[PDB]
Scaffold this motif. Structure first.
Motif: not given
Length: 87
Positions: A12, A14, A18-21, A71
């Motif tokens: 992932k 992320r 930003s506003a997400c991954k 992650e």
């Protein structure tokens, strides 16, 4: 001998800036990293990444065999990540 990969690895990507991954998956984990520093653009200098598992710190070039759904979070001298713990 040999070593076929009967299982694609996912990570992932992320980003704190930003506003997400971006859950990117690929057989050669090396592909997820490269393409990772690309769509996220993370230079070695004036930059830095960190594991979102508990706030660990790592770089796109220091990721050997990341764990499944590794992650990763984008970060730079102008950014920082505390961690994912309860303390």
């Amino acid at each position: 001998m040999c070593a076929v990969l009967r299982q694609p690895k996912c990570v992932k990507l992320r980003a704190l800036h930003s506003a997400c991954k971006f859950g990117v998956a690929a057989r050669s984990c090396q592909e997820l990293l490269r393409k990772g520093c690309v769509r996220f653009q993370l230079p070695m200098p004036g930059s830095r990444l960190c594991l979102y598992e508990d706030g660990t710190e790592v770089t796109d070039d220091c990721f050997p065999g990341l764990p499944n759904d590794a992650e990763l979070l984008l970060l730079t001298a102008g950014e920082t990540w505390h961690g994912y713990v309860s303390d």
